[PDB]
Design a protein around this motif. Structure first.
Motif, PDB file in Angstrom:
ATOM      1  N   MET A   1       0.919  -1.219  -0.091  1.00 46.94           N
ATOM      2  CA  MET A   1      -0.045  -0.152  -0.018  1.00 46.94           C
ATOM      3  C   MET A   1       0.831   1.205   0.044  1.00 46.94           C
ATOM      4  SD  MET A   1      -2.421  -1.815  -0.251  1.00 46.94           S
ATOM      5  CE  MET A   1      -3.533  -0.434  -0.514  1.00 46.94           C
ATOM      6  N   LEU A   2       1.778   1.451   1.053  1.00 41.48           N
ATOM      7  CA  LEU A   2       2.596   2.540   1.035  1.00 41.48           C
ATOM      8  C   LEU A   2       1.885   3.580   2.049  1.00 41.48           C
ATOM      9  CD1 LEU A   2       3.812   3.020  -2.591  1.00 41.48           C
ATOM     10  CD2 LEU A   2       5.268   1.520  -0.955  1.00 41.48           C
ATOM     11  N   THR A  11       6.798  13.269  -2.479  1.00 41.93           N
ATOM     12  CA  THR A  11       8.143  13.586  -1.611  1.00 41.93           C
ATOM     13  C   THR A  11       8.810  12.037  -1.597  1.00 41.93           C
ATOM     14  OG1 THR A  11       8.815  14.555   0.393  1.00 41.93           O
ATOM     15  CG2 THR A  11       6.848  13.406   0.218  1.00 41.93           C
ATOM     16  N   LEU A  12       8.187  11.156  -2.006  1.00 39.22           N
ATOM     17  CA  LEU A  12       8.613   9.728  -1.808  1.00 39.22           C
ATOM     18  C   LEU A  12       9.966   9.614  -2.333  1.00 39.22           C
ATOM     19  CD1 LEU A  12       7.912   7.313  -0.419  1.00 39.22           C
ATOM     20  CD2 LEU A  12       6.911   6.310  -2.337  1.00 39.22           C
ATOM     21  N   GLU A  13      10.303  10.013  -3.676  1.00 39.61           N
ATOM     22  CA  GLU A  13      11.477   9.766  -4.252  1.00 39.61           C
ATOM     23  C   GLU A  13      11.816   8.695  -5.057  1.00 39.61           C
ATOM     24  OE1 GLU A  13      13.786   7.783  -4.188  1.00 39.61           O
ATOM     25  OE2 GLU A  13      15.449   8.277  -4.910  1.00 39.61           O
ATOM     26  N   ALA A 200       0.957   9.468 -10.043  1.00 39.86           N
ATOM     27  CA  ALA A 200       1.446  10.075  -8.840  1.00 39.86           C
ATOM     28  C   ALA A 200       1.251  11.291  -8.377  1.00 39.86           C
ATOM     29  CB  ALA A 200       2.694   9.617  -8.662  1.00 39.86           C
ATOM     30  N   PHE A 201       1.354  12.173  -9.520  1.00 37.70           N
ATOM     31  CA  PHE A 201       1.256  13.714  -9.105  1.00 37.70           C
ATOM     32  C   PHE A 201      -0.198  14.026  -9.177  1.00 37.70           C
ATOM     33  CE2 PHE A 201       0.466  17.827 -11.230  1.00 37.70           C
ATOM     34  CZ  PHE A 201       0.976  18.613 -10.355  1.00 37.70           C
TER      35      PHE A 201
END
Lengths: 291, 49
Positions: A1-2, A11-13, A200-201
């Protein structure tokens, strides 16, 4: 899931965004400068945007393992996409916003029925608020519901070359972009942006709240400006090359106005008629939600 | 301490769009024997036909 990181999923990268400045990659912030701006005697007025009718296509579940995220990124930036506005993929997506549904959006961008173990995804609540808003694009094409085009572009321009006293005010003089070039540069950057996982964005542009949002918009103000430019390329009419010294230069003719077609059939990426129908109803959602 | 013999290629303009040709075209011209008015007229005719 994260789960979700507080301060963004961006901000994960693990997944970021780097335009390939030839042999060496860079950051979107670093690329914008190579371009300068020429004020011409033309003026655009910032026009207000109409609300989007709430009537996203009903739930169907045809079995396709639909690449909804892949399809989205393809039409806006993709080089000569085909059948982008077909009905079947979106209808399947809208099932996502439904509380309690065995249908999880894969992290990689592929949608499933039921689930899987070997694949981690986005928690059902993050996607729920996402598909609540981008399912609507699906029917952008209908004669009744269809969105504008010749006027949303009064916003594209302020962002690309919007001076700060200009996006503070309402009106901006029609500009003319020009930056250094490598010949196959326009297509080259368009080939590159296609893999940004633009899902993602967006899946986090609906999950972030009052403070986490204030920080999100103030940092990615570039990652947005980038896809805006590459998109505004297909639209502006004439591409003129300047041969100075030992340098070569590309000029994009008018940042703020829909010529309605061509750009350069060879020098850039082109937009079909089933593209203006799409990219338009897209910006009508990201912009409104964005501001 | 005497001179020598070189060529300039007209690089002392640094201004583009002019001085297209280079050094080597003069070497070919000097390599040529000498062409008279009627010889040039004949040479133009031959390459044309």
């Amino acid at each position: 899931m994260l789960q979700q990181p507080t301060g963004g999923y961006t901000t994960l990268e693990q997944f970021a965004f780097t335009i390939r400045n030839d042999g060496t990659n860079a950051t979107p912030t670093q690329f914008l400068q190579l371009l300068s701006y020429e004020a011409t005697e033309n003026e655009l007025v910032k026009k207000t945007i109409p609300t989007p009718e709430t009537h996203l296509p009903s739930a169907r579940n045809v079995p396709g393992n639909v690449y909804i995220e892949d399809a989205i990124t393809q039409a806006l930036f993709g080089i000569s996409a085909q059948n982008v506005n077909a009905h079947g993929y979106f209808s399947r997506l809208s099932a996502l916003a439904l509380p309690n549904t065995s249908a999880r959006l894969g992290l990689d961008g592929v949608i499933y029925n039921s689930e899987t173990i070997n694949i981690p995804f986005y928690d059902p609540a993050a996607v729920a608020n996402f598909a609540a808003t981008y399912a609507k694009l699906g029917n952008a094409s209908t004669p009744r519901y269809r969105a504008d085009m010749i006027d949303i572009y009064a916003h594209v321009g302020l962002e690309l070359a919007g001076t700060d006293a200009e996006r503070a005010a309402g009106v901006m003089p029609v500009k003319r972009a020009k930056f250094d070039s490598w010949e196959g540069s326009l297509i080259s950057l368009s080939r590159d942006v296609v893999n940004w996982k633009i899902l993602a964005f967006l899946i986090d542009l609906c999950s972030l709240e009052g403070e986490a949002l204030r920080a999100f918009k103030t940092r990615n103000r570039d990652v947005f400006r980038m896809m805006l430019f590459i998109m505004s390329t297909a639209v502006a009419a004439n591409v003129v090359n300047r041969k100075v010294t030992k340098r070569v230069d590309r000029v994009l003719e008018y940042i703020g106005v829909n010529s309605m077609r061509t750009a350069g059939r060879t020098a850039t990426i082109t937009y079909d008629l089933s593209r203006h129908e799409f990219a338009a109803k897209f910006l009508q959602l990201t912009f409104t939600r964005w501001n | 301490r005497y001179h020598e013999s070189v060529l300039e290629i007209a690089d002392i303009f640094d201004q583009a769009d002019f001085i297209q040709t280079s050094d080597a075209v003069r070497q070919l011209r000097a390599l040529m024997p000498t062409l008279s008015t009627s010889q040039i007229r004949h040479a133009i005719e031959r390459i044309a036909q």
